Design a binder for this molecule. Structure first.
Ligand SMILES: NC(=O)c1ccc[n+]([C@@H]2O[C@H](COP(=O)([O-])OP(=O)(O)OC[C@H]3O[C@@H](n4cnc5c(N)ncnc54)[C@H](OP(=O)(O)O)[C@@H]3O)[C@@H](O)[C@H]2O)c1
Lengths: 112, 319
């Protein structure tokens, strides 16, 4: 029953330590002028974040290579079986189904 | 004797002294003597480093610092001995856990109304407040109108000053509001009746002094400081949330510098507009400044961009 005793112990030191740092001098009596001088060294910066694509694909591109290496995960439990040939013949398919899915897209990464 | 032009690194013949001159007001006067030329001897109490933000004020060899306590009758006698005019802004809000506050408007302004009178200052000056009346109010607001009586005895020439509730940049008057993110705005006392006072903008007061600083011909003759038009409404407390869109402290934090459940809540609603017959301002002018236009600047909050503010006030009445 002692796991949650070992988790909420950990946060409660951390969720404590924000206030004893952030908050404690935050109410101190120093000046702290409201002037809009903050947001350093790009003073104003008025724009939307524009869509920039080769930022985007490197999200998608991963998400799919991700899946099957969940599918690929239960090899070391499956190395203990009865008929094993249906493993080696089958196990090696996923991989090559992964590696193929590279080679195609590999004609165009662009600047990744 | 005045030389040249008033830019900086000039003379203009007046020395001065300004006691206090650390917190909101005094910092903002000396900055007008670090321009037209002077010799501004600013003493200060306890603060070694809180006085630095001041120093790029006079050119070079103009302002000069000393150290003093003020209950020692010598500390005020060592400086002033060479001076022309000496004004006095000293005094503060809440009773200190050390200074019992009773005579710090009585003994202190006299303690510096000691040898100053003797030693040959001239055009000595002191501060009053538009709302202080010797009838019974208000525990802090009282003892201030004693100085108008008790202290005026000494130095027959004063030109002691009587301004209103003032709104500066870093000031604590109009800033007690909008710090009120809290269980809710509760006016004083939950009534929209007698707000508001004459909210003059801090420039005009600090341009009054230096306009009387060599006036000439105002000594003994006290003045009071007009506000803008005209009286004001409850909307002033709504106006705060209309646009806002809803020294020597410590290392960590202090123990008590509160909202003072005491005179503070009742000092703001005491109103009492008072005698017009005081000259008191355009004569010392020429200055008067509004509110609606100058209250965006000092108020900047978490939008920091949008304003689009069309809403105004009549006066309001009793006007
Ligand atoms: N005209 C107005 O609208 C108005 C409004 C409110 C109050 N007042 C009064 O008019 C003056 C304006 O003061 P302020 O706006 O600058 O606020 P403030 O905070 O009272 O500034 C006064 C400065 O002088 C110090 N001080 C307090 N008692 C002192 C004493 N006996 N001797 C030497 N220094 C003392 C204070 O702390 P330190 O000793 O550490 O320096 C502070 O540094 C004050 O007298 C205030 O009570 C005027």
């Amino acid at each position: 029953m002692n796991l949650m005793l070992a988790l909420l112990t950990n946060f409660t030191l951390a969720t404590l330590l924000v206030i004893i740092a952030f908050w404690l001098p935050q109410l101190n009596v120093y000046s702290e002028k409201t002037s809009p001088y903050e947001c350093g060294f790009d003073p104003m910066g008025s724009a939307r974040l524009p869509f920039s694509m080769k930022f985007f694909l490197v999200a998608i591109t991963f998400l799919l290579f991700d899946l099957e290496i969940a599918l690929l995960l239960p090899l070391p439990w499956a190395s203990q079986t009865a008929n094993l040939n249906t493993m080696l013949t089958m196990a090696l398919f996923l991989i090559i189904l992964l590696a193929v899915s590279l080679a195609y897209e590999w004609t165009q990464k662009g600047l990744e | 004797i005045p030389h040249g032009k008033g830019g900086r690194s000039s003379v203009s013949g007046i020395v001065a002294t300004v006691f206090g001159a650390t917190g909101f007001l005094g910092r903002y006067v000396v900055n007008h003597l670090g321009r037209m030329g002077s010799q501004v001897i600013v003493p200060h109490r306890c603060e070694p480093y809180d006085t630095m933000h001041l120093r790029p004020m006079g050119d070079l060899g103009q302002i000069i610092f000393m150290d003093w306590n003020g209950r020692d009758k010598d500390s005020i006698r060592r400086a002033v001995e060479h001076s022309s005019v000496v004004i006095n802004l000293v005094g503060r809000e809440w009773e200190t856990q050390n200074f019992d506050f009773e005579d710090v408007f009585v003994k202190i302004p006299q303690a510096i109304a000691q040898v100053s009178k003797e030693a040959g200052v001239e055009k000595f000056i002191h501060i009053s407040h538009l709302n202080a009346d010797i009838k019974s109010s208000s525990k802090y607001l009282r003892s201030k109108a004693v100085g108008e009586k008790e202290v005026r005895e000494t130095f027959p020439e004063a030109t002691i000053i009587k301004p209103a509730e003032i709104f500066g940049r870093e000031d604590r008057f109009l800033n007690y509001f909008a710090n009120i993110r809290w269980f809710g705005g509760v006016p004083l006392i939950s009534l929209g009746k007698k707000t508001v006072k004459q909210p003059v903008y801090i420039v005009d007061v600090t341009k009054g002094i230096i306009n009387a600083i060599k006036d000439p011909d105002a000594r003994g003759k006290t003045f009071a400081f007009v506000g803008p038009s005209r009286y004001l409404l409850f909307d002033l407390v709504q106006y705060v949330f209309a646009v806002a869109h809803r020294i020597g402290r410590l290392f960590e934090i202090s123990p008590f510098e509160p909202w003072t459940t005491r005179d503070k809540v009742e000092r703001i609603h005491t109103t009492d507009k008072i005698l017009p017959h005081l000259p008191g301002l355009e004569d010392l002018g020429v200055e008067a400044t509004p509110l609606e236009l100058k209250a965006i600047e000092v108020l900047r909050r978490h939008r920091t961009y949008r304003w689009l503010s069309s809403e105004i006030e009549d006066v309001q009445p009793a006007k």
